[PDB]
Swiss-Prot record:
It catalyses: Hydrolysis of proteins with specificity similar to that of pepsin A, prefers hydrophobic residues at P1 and P1', but does not cleave 14-Ala-|-Leu-15 in the B chain of insulin or Z-Glu-Tyr. Clots milk. One of its GO terms (biological process) is proteolysis. This is Endothiapepsin. It is an enzyme of class 3 (hydrolase). One of its GO terms (molecular function) is aspartic-type endopeptidase activity. It comes from Cryphonectria parasitica.
């Protein structure tokens, strides 16, 4: 089997992407944030604290003839930005782009952090990291991908995120028309439960490539590119007037600037992030200070290849017995 679904930015900055997902019988379509950095499929629901729901579409398990309470199961998750959610668990039929999993754990939120409440466009998250990170207790649950894997034509999914435009998540096949050149594959460590890999270096604009190993995770659920302070300083030093602002919470730059590109290495291959992808716009409405799309990972504890990086590539998440990650230009 295969599936193919379009993913759409939630706003004009590509702050996140939402993908429609069918849950239950009859189908209830919710728009979920597909998240290769976590492993829980959770939704706003009829059980979510009412004051914490603000425009989201909710899953109502009592209206699904295939929903079943997973008795005794609870979940609770915290993301690296401080966002969180928790609740109980149902199993139900879940379909993405024509690919159907029966008995999928659908984690119903009883509580969500304000950061989720305020995102009216995001009805929940669909985790695509390794199932070892799943937070359901006392019986850990499998991701949608893990459940689908054996039925898929090939045990892979691909992320093809757009810049200020829709893109595609495919399951079970590689669309050879969706990228240019060849796909370069690189090793993955699953020890921490993430799609963790090692970039071979970087370049700033038209500068020379610096060969250096940068361990990080491929995280579709993180907006920006978080890299070591040395790398990030080297980038922003090429933008007149750019500076790290403690009050704002990262690097800002004059909105009048033209940003240089940023290149990262994948083996001997190179992925180029155009400068425009690194512009996250005014820090507040009407400001001439703009927020940068490349930020320091210092104090996160891990480097994160988020959407800024991933949307410059066609990315293969290869879930074979020994997982790997593939990147192609597009």
């Amino acid at each position: 089997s295969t599936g193919s679904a379009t993913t759409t930015p939630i706003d004009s900055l590509d702050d996140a992407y939402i993908t429609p997902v069918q849950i239950g019988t009859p189908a209830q379509t919710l728009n979920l944030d597909f998240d290769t950095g976590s492993s829980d499929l959770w939704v706003f629901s009829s059980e979510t604290t009412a004051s914490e729901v603000d425009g989201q579409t909710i899953y109502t398990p009592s209206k699904s003839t295939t929903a079943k309470l997973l008795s005794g199961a609870t979940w609770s998750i915290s993301y690296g930005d401080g966002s969180s959610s928790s609740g109980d668990v149902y199993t139900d039929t879940v379909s993405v782009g024509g690919l159907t999993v029966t008995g999928q754990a659908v984690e119903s939120a009883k509580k969500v952090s304000s950061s989720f409440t305020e995102d009216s466009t995001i009805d929940g998250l669909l985790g695509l990291a390794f199932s070892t990170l799943n937070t359901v207790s006392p019986t850990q649950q499998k991701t949608f991908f893990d459940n689908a894997k054996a039925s898929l034509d090939s045990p892979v999914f691909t992320a093809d995120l757009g810049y200020h435009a829709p893109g595609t998540y495919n399951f079970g096949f590689i669309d050879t028309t969706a990228y240019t050149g060849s796909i370069t594959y690189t090793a993955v460590s699953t020890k921490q439960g993430f799609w963790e890999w090692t970039s071979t270096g970087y370049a700033v604009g038209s500068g020379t490539f610096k060969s250096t190993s940068i361990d990080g995770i491929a995280d579709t659920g993180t907006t920006l590119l978080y890299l070591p302070a040395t790398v990030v300083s080297a980038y922003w030093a090429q933008v007149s007037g750019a500076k790290s602002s403690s009050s704002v919470g990262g690097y800002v730059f004059p909105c009048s600037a033209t940003l240089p590109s940023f290149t990262f290495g994948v083996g001997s291959a190179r992925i180029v992030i155009p400068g425009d992808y690194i512009d996250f716009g005014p820090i507040s409405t009407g400001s001439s200070s703009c927020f940068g799309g490349i930020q320091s990972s210092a104090g996160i504890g891990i480097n994160i290849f988020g959407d800024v990086a991933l949307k410059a590539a066609f990315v293969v998440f290869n879930g074979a017995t020994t997982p790997t990650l593939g990147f192609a230009s597009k």
